[PDB]
């Protein structure tokens, strides 16, 4: 026939890919970082507890001034905290209480939001009327909206559970670029620090690296065995870390095109909900289903602490832009700020 | 107090935000959500439109019954986003009862009944749904009584039913074949029902079942069990 010939061509291309990836794996990250001294043990104590949510917290994001937060929850609200003094700046009532993502613009003006309603709401905080109006409602996806990350004050890239990502134009409202190629849902997104590339982790046991200027998939990374609930770049944009559901984080590398490490412990049997590196890249925090985060040494896999202060599953967390804090958020409607 | 004027005014604004949050969380603590997930081919539209005339994304229908507010979250019908539909009291299933002898369109081999029962298995046997009290309607009972006195059923399924020419026999057979799918289902009973040609008793029955569920759940926080 003809379809089987193209399938054989695809199979031999995948074999060429596997041989090219195997030809470069001369050493590992363990056989090289086995001489530097470990980090020791890292005690982190809760510094603040931010109360006021009345339901499960599903996402959060840090401002780029390292002080202001934002937190979405199934209460139906979107609160903007002041993390230094624990008081609330704004509280935004959502039109649909089924919210599963959150963002915070890199300039501080706007705030994005999204959920099961298939739309991405852009809110304008610095109005001259003293309110927080819905500045835009971006529609055009066909499945639930899992993550959204601001790029400029005019462009936003987001990922939905209809096997697509999309780069929008907040002024007009139309999809500038659509990103296709996955097979299952898409539940995670992370932008490179230079904001020309980004990576997503699908419900397909795969991650992909797109470039927002062209609209094509550069590379794809396999190796997991379950969903990929989270993703995050390395602070220099040449590696990322996925957090799966089979109780294992990993560390891929965009130039070696392979997998480097495998952060997994035998006590751990529950899936990761959120990973986030540190400022220098020597830690890898990972919130788990068993109610507590971890702190993985990201050059030798040796676990180096535990942030156990929650009493329910910990949702997305985030390390500040200047480095001074971590901020987890869990299903008991409490944020915490470790340090 | 070591706070300046703007700091004290910001703390006052925060306390006012907190008061408004507490009020909106009092208004939504006496709210009863009822998820609605049928089987597609089971006349969901007919029940929905009759409930709408008597009173892309996810849908939602607000109403009130006997001074209690109900939300009906009709999801537009997978893995990890049904874990937000916990703390949603009394999921409300819905099946067409007269669909025991037809066969699916895209699959001309398997029966529609076993497919609906497998959906029921995957939904009830979830772990996060171990605090929600499944209701179970069966529409088109008049279709069932029309199509039960003309055909037999022992030739369809191998499970023992008995005589094929009545109503109560096939009804108890259907309720047993649907109920038997659970696995150690305590603290969440299965209020089966039987909805004929459409009427006004449906929402009264749903209110009775949700009242029973909230009673059995208040009867454990008070240690009064």
């Amino acid at each position, epitope marked *: 026939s003809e379809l089987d010939q193209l399938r054989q061509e695809a199979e031999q291309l995948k074999n060429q890919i596997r041989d090219a990836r195997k030809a470069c794996a001369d050493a590992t990250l363990s056989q090289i970082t086995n001489n530097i001294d470990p980090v020791g043990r890292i005690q982190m104590r809760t510094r603040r507890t931010l109360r006021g949510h009345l339901a499960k917290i599903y996402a959060m994001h840090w401002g780029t001034d390292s002080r202001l937060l934002v937190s979405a929850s199934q209460d139906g609200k979107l609160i903007i905290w002041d993390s230094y003094t624990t008081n609330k*700046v704004h509280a935004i009532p959502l039109r649909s209480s089924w919210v599963m993502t959150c963002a915070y613009a890199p300039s501080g003006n706007y705030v994005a939001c999204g959920g099961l309603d298939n739309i991405c709401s852009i809110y304008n905080l610095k109005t001259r*009327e003293g309110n927080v109006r819905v500045s835009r409602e971006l529609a055009g996806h066909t499945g639930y909206l899992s993550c959204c990350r601001f790029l400029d004050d005019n462009q936003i890239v987001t990922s939905s559970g209809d096997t697509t990502c999309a780069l929008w134009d907040i002024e007009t409202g139309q999809q500038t670029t659509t990103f296709t190629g996955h097979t299952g849902d898409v539940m995670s997104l992370s932008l490179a620090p230079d904001t020309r590339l980004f990576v997503s982790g699908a419900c397909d046991a795969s991650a992909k690296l797109w470039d927002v200027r062209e609209g094509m998939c550069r590379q794809t990374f396999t190796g997991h065995e379950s969903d990929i609930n989270a993703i995050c770049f390395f602070p220099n944009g040449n590696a990322f870390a996925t957090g799966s559901d089979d109780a294992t984080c990993r560390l891929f590398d965009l130039r070696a095109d392979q997998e480097l490490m495998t952060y997994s412990h035998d006590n751990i049997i529950c899936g990761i909900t959120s990973v986030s590196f540190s400022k220098s890249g020597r830690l890898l925090l990972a919130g788990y289903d068993d109610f507590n985060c971890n702190v993985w040494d990201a050059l030798k896999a040796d676990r180096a602490g535990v942030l156990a202060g929650h009493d329910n599953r910990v949702s997305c967390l985030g390390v500040t832009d200047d480095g001074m804090a971590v901020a987890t958020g869990s299903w008991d409607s409490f944020l915490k700020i470790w340090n | 107090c070591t706070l300046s004027a703007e700091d004290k005014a910001a703390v006052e604004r925060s306390k006012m935000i907190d008061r408004n949050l507490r009020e909106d969380g009092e208004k939504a603590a006496r709210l009863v959500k009822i998820l609605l997930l049928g089987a597609g081919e089971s006349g969901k539209s007919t029940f929905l439109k009759q409930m709408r005339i008597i009173h892309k994304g996810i849908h939602e229908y607000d109403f009130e019954i006997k001074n209690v507010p109900f939300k009906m979250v009709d999801v537009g019908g997978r893995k990890r986003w049904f874990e937000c539909f916990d703390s949603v009291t009394s999921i409300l299933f819905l099946v067409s009862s007269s669909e025991f002898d037809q066969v699916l369109m895209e699959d001309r081999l398997t029966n529609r009944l076993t497919e609906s029962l497998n959906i029921f298995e995957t939904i009830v046997n979830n772990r996060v749904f171990s605090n929600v009290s499944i209701i179970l309607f069966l529409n088109k009972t008049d279709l069932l009584e029309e199509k039960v006195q003309v055909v037999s059923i022992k030739d369809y399924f191998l499970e023992f039913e008995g005589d094929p020419h009545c109503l109560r026999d096939v009804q108890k057979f259907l309720v047993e074949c649907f109920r038997g799918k659970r696995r150690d289902q305590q603290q969440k009973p299965l209020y089966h029902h039987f909805t004929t040609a459409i009427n006004t008793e449906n929402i009264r029955l749903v209110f009775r079942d949700v009242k029973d569920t909230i009673l059995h759940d208040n009867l454990k926080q008070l240690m009064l069990q």
Partner: single-chain antibody
């Protein structure tokens, strides 16, 4: 955004009045409101402040007990009940909105004011001069010296700068000594630290002539300055 006031006119001494302030165009329910008087030729002076709900209320030490500020949210109005009108109360009265959170810009929008004529601890802030001659195209400077250190322990000085054009209502120009207000062209800069503050202007225009006032916001009463006149 619009504030407009009413209730002026000639008053007999020893009487009583009520001033009204209607606010159309913004969210009045979440905006603290100040009254600010102004003598015939003697510059601005704070009068009273009422909070965003109906909580903290403050008065100047010369109008405490006589006056009474109040607000009505569903009608979007603000009232000042003045009792025992003395001869030193003839003035033009302005409303001022101000919202307080992290990073806000209080004293946003001044109203238009009513004229009210009758028949017949405390931070002290001084201005440099009373009139300077300038030319359009020259970079100028205005100095305002406090008496207590306005640099609070959290790092932000609380000195503001307003500009009043001839025949108009003053507008916010600079808040917290460095931050520029909205709609202000990139020519005004704020500098200094501690108890010596400075506003520097680049090449000026025909719309930069007026009187410049420096406020403080550490503690009530908020004490304005004497004003420096920018004449051509």
């Amino acid at each position: 955004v619009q504030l407009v006031e009413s209730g002026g006119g000639l008053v007999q001494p020893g009487g009583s009045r009520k001033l009204s302030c209607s606010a159309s165009g913004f969210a009045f329910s979440s905006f603290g409101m100040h009254w600010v008087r102004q003598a015939p030729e003697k510059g601005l002076e704070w009068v009273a402040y009422i909070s965003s709900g109906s909580g903290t209320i403050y008065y100047a030490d010369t109008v405490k007990g006589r006056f009474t500020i109040s607000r009505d949210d569903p009608k979007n109005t603000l009232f000042l009940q003045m009792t025992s009108l003395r001869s030193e109360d003839t003035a033009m009265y302005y409303c001022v909105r101000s919202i307080y959170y992290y990073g806000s810009s209080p004293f946003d929008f001044w109203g238009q004011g009513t004229t009210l004529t009758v028949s017949s601890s405390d931070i002290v802030m001084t201005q440099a001069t009373s009139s300077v001659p300038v030319t359009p195209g020259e970079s100028v400077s205005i100095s305002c010296r406090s008496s207590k250190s306005l640099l609070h322990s959290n790092g932000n000085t609380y000195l503001y700068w307003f500009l009043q054009r001839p025949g108009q209502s003053p507008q916010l120009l600079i808040y917290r000594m460095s931050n520029l207000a909205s709609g202000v062209p990139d020519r005004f800069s704020g500098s200094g630290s501690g108890t010596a503050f400075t506003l520097t202007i680049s090449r000026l225009e025909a719309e930069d002539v007026g009187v410049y006032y420096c406020m403080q916001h550490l503690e009530y009463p908020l004490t304005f300055g004497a004003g420096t006149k920018l004449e051509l």
